[PDB]
Swiss-Prot record, chains A, B:
Source organism per UniProt: Mus musculus
Domain spans labelled EF-hand: 18-53
Modified residues (Phosphoserine): 32
Lineage of producing organism: Eukaryota, Metazoa, Chordata, Craniata, Vertebrata
Binding residues for Ca(2+) 1: 32, 37
Binding site for Ca(2+) 2: 64, 66, 68, 70, 75
Subunit-structure text: Homodimer. Part of a copper-dependent multiprotein complex containing S100A13, FGF1 and SYT1. Interacts with FGF1 and SYT1. Interacts with IL1A.
InterPro entries: EF-hand-dom_pair, S100_Ca-bd_sub
GO MF terms, alphabetically ordered: calcium ion binding; copper ion binding; lipid binding
Function: Plays a role in the export of proteins that lack a signal peptide and are secreted by an alternative pathway. Binds two calcium ions per subunit. Binds one copper ion. Binding of one copper ion does not interfere with calcium binding. Required for the copper-dependent stress-induced export of IL1A and FGF1. The calcium-free protein binds to lipid vesicles containing phosphatidylserine, but not to vesicles containing phosphatidylcholine.
Predominant location: cytoplasm
The name this protein goes by in its record: Protein S100-A13
One GO cellular component, as annotated: cytosol
Gene: S100a13
Pfam families listed in its UniProt record: S_100
């Protein structure tokens, strides 16, 4: 089949949204999340296993990029490239069969 | 900060992977998941709330597209556009503040 609406994966959206995206709280209104606690990302995610390497500058620019990395209003499309942040490197590392 | 390695969202990868992606088992080897139970997607996800409309043909072609929608070996990048399948429509619907 095709990926029309929210597939079973939406249930997963609850984790990703209830985890880091909860930092939305930083911004008063109940619109979106910004890049305040996001700063807790590259920093804390810096030393991973198969780390990517949160380049300082990248960590700076990306703010504007994934500004609304989380959303309460319409910027949920931001999560689009978010949930992938995990899958990206996980594409290769996924090869548990080495 | 920037989305270098696996951010807190990776924890969410567990749901999406442990939910629908568990259909991988369809394929003997422990490499990847295909499009057998995926056929349970558009079909079941068909009648959603803000449904997208799993077009029959689309549901057919998408197979090849999201073939390894799930992965045990390297096709995890497939999940890249997967976890988003939820976020996509959820971008607008996200607007609980209407």
């Amino acid at each position: 089949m095709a990926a029309e609406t929210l597939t079973e994966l939406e249930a997963a959206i609850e984790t990703v949204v209830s985890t880091f995206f909860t930092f939305a709280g930083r911004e008063g209104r109940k619109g979106s999340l910004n890049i305040n606690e996001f700063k807790e990302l590259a920093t804390q995610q810096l030393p991973h296993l198969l780390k990517d390497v949160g380049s300082l500058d990248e960590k700076m620019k990306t703010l504007d990029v994934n500004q609304d990395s989380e959303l309460r209003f319409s910027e949920y499309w931001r999560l689009i490239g978010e949930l992938a942040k995990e899958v990206r490197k996980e594409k290769a590392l996924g090869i548990r069969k080495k």
